[PDB]
Structure 1
Amino acid sequence: TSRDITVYPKDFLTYFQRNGSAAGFDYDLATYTQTLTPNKASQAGNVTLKTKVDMSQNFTFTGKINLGDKAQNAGGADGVGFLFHPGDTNVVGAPGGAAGIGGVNGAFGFKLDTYYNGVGENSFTPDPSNFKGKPFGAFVDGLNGQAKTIASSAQSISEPSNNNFVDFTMSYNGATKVMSVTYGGQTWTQDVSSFVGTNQAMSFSIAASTGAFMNLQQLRNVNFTYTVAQGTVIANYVDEQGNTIAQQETTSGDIDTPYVTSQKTIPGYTFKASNGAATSGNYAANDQTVNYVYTRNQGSIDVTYIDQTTGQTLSKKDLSGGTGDSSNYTTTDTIKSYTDAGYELVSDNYPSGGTVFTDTAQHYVVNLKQKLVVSSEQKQVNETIQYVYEDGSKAADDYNAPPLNFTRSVTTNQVTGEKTYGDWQAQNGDSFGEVVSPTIKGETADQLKIDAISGITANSADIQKKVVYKRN
């Protein structure tokens, strides 16, 4: 590959980051020596690799390790750990029994344990009982966070003595997935495929730890030949409330080589903003993540009610929801309310099957008019002539003249109450007849005829007359 590099002893600080206690000590370029811990108590120091490692390529790690001058019995602690995890380059494991492996997830590697921890806690499972107070080198399974020492790898090592540097070698076949560690004519082997999984890019941390007991722990003449793993960009396509609304796009590439991400076009949604990384940039050692946030496309429906009679808006129900939600709305009730008030439905554009919000607006109309009830008014003007004697006794039957009837339409607006009368129309005529007063033998009428009367209007008063007969 083009990312196949060999870390030289003089460029150590280029590819490795002194962290913790280690940051107090400069790299001595005469010896090529990096202190991890000094010979003081409760110290922690490490170097982290600035990149990650393609675990689908071969790597060869060479150097010398000073484990100190004291052994456990003389007050010597805690050892040096080599950490392999998939998380952040700048993460390191817990000190003590965790040996700088435990406390990280998906964590494996090699310890040189210069202190026996029989009492276990969360960071680490007790050290193998067969190595009570004895220096040993092992492989560690820190996948579940808790560093477990594999007793099948548990081998003794030489006690830290007069601050001496023993040769260390860690070799790795990309294709076998087998790790080979040599420390002063003790060798280790293990298939690490059960750990690398699929990640094929792990962070590397060499980490020393003192506690109550101490030791100078130091590194010298570090030769790392490995393939720089390539950076990942994750792009998530999520709604406003975090729920994912389109498949994610995990695109990988060589560090410091460009990356691009696509603003997906999502049915039912419109792009709002891109929280997180740039949508465009350069690949980097750690995972970068750009989140595309989308808004839920919202539909309009407005159902206007109109009083035709006035050409005035009665009521207007604005509805808004999500492109494809039902509205669950029916006119029927709002219609009723107007109909009961004396209105009359004309038309209803509102679909019978509720409705559904769409990316385009809907506008429906309910046409209502003030009802009008047509009645009839009738009025009658009569004429009566009473034929009587001087004592009031009837001389002759009362004449009721042919009645003069009159009709008018009455339109009552069932909303305003406003009664629009039509006109008075004469059914019978406008004029009452002449009535010649009957002749009675041996009597004389005070009026021998009642004259015909013209100009009868529907408001006219009923005519009442009285003819008195006198004897002779």
Structure 2
Amino acid sequence: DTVTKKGTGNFTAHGDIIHKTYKEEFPNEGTLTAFNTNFNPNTGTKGALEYNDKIDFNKDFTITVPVANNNQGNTTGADGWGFMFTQGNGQDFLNQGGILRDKGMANASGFKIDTAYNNVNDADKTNNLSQIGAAKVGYGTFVKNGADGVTNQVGQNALNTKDKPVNKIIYADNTTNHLDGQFHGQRLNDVVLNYDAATSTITATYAGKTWKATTDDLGIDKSQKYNFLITSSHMQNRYSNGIMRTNLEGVTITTPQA
């Protein structure tokens, strides 16, 4: 027996979050939740949706987040998506930062869809990223912030892909054929974080690619309850819209009942 809560009213907003419909671009969707709309190239912008219930890493879970990326090159667009687990909260994230850059909240960890060429970790041509500038190309990976806040790449590269680089994600294209069957990252697509307590492993699925990390890789203490944040950010000194969207009705947190 499992239970599923959906986003809708089970998330609290922190920082640069608005909820509105996009009837021209997403006519089948209802109210979408948008990060980074509050343009300011002085400061950049960030936001986090904090799940109102705790995550228990002694029990299985599956978290599904529909995301739609900015149709924007990796030097001008948003940093990406940080699916963070932390004993800290959204307020801390606004004050200390997240998992999408080189430094954020101490001990925060989780899965990132990195959609920006901005940091030394982005520099890894073998594993992560070799197309820079106009390319709507990024990469996925688990990351852990250390005790010092520094973000490290952890866990496995993508399983059984032939892509080069192995962690590559083409996070957007200009397609008008949204229901091609091909992956179109600017449309809504599920990120699935499956956690198997028996193997202490989170599997992340996005764009038909799979990553895994253990709780040990993420520095997660299974005895402690964690908060779950969906985060995005857009750098200072980026003159673009870096708008990153989710459908909070499509956000599902499934756990065993006990």
Report the TM-score, using the length of structure 1 for normalisation: 0.41
Question: Could you say which residue in structure 1 is the equivalent of 2:10?
Answer: 15
5 Å matches for 1:191-230? 191-194=214-217, 195-211=219-235, 212-213=237-238, 214-220=241-247, 221-226=250-255
Question: Could you say which residue in structure 2 is the equivalent of 1:139?
Answer: 142
Counterpart of 1:204 in structure 2: which amino acid?
A: F
Match of 1:184 among 207, 218, 239: 207
CA distance in 2, matches of 1:26, 1:171: 29
CA distance in 1, matches of 2:92, 2:21: 21
Aligned residues of 2:100 and 2:114 also touching (Cα < 8 A): yes
Gaps of at least 5 residues in structure 2 are 23-27, 158-165, 175-185
Shift of 1:159: 3.0
Aligned residues of 1:79 and 1:112 also touching (Cα < 8 A): yes
Q: Does 1:25 align with 2:28?
A: no
Question: Could you say which residue in structure 2 is the equivalent of 1:61?
Answer: 63
Shift of 1:103: 2.2
CA distance in 1, matches of 2:9, 2:46: 21
Q: Does 1:40 align with 2:75?
A: no
Counterpart of 2:172 in structure 1: which amino acid?
A: P
| More strand by percentage | 1
Provide closer, same or farther for how the CA distance between residues 225 and 90 of structure 1 changes in structure 2, counting only shifts above 3 A.
farther
Query: SS of 1:116's equivalent?
Result: coil
Provide closer, same or farther for how the CA distance between residues 92 and 43 of structure 1 changes in structure 2, counting only shifts above 3 A.
same
Counterpart of 1:53 in structure 2: which amino acid?
A: I
Provide closer, same or farther for how the CA distance between residues 27 and 45 of structure 1 changes in structure 2, counting only shifts above 3 A.
farther
Query: SS of 2:170's equivalent?
Result: coil
Question: Could you say which residue in structure 1 is the equivalent of 2:114?
Answer: 113
Counterpart of 1:185 in structure 2: which amino acid?
A: G
CA distance in 2, matches of 1:7, 1:27: 22
Gaps of at least 5 residues in structure 1 are 120-125, 230-472
- Larger CA Rg, structure 1 vs 2: 1
Provide closer, same or farther for how the CA distance between residues 86 and 175 of structure 1 changes in structure 2, counting only shifts above 3 A.
farther
5 Å matches for 1:385-396? none
Q: When the two structures are aligned, how many residues end up with a matched partner?
A: 215
5 Å matches for 1:6-405? 6-8=4-6, 12-22=7-17, 24-26=18-20, 30-38=29-37, 40-41=39-40, 42-73=44-75, 75-88=76-89, 90-92=91-93, 94-95=96-97, 98-99=99-100, 102-119=103-120, 126-130=121-125, 131-132=129-130, 133=132, 134-144=137-147, 145-150=149-154, 152-153=156-157, 155-162=167-174, 163-194=186-217, 195-211=219-235, 212-213=237-238, 214-220=241-247, 221-226=250-255
Shift of 1:55: 0.7
Deviations 1:312-335 (A, max 9, x none): xxxxxxxxxxxxxxxxxxxxxxxx
CA distance in 1, matches of 2:102, 2:62: 20
Bigger RCO (CA 8 Å, 6+ sep): 2
CA distance in 1, matches of 2:244, 2:53: 24
Shift of 1:200: 3.7
State, as a whole percentage, how many aligned pairs show the same letter: 24
Provide closer, same or farther for how the CA distance between residues 164 and 170 of structure 1 changes in structure 2, counting only shifts above 3 A.
same
Shift of 1:30: 4.8
CA distance in 1, matches of 2:86, 2:212: 19
Question: Could you say which residue in structure 1 is the equivalent of 2:161?
Answer: none
Report the TM-score, using the length of structure 2 for normalisation: 0.72
Aligned residues of 1:101 and 1:107 also touching (Cα < 8 A): no
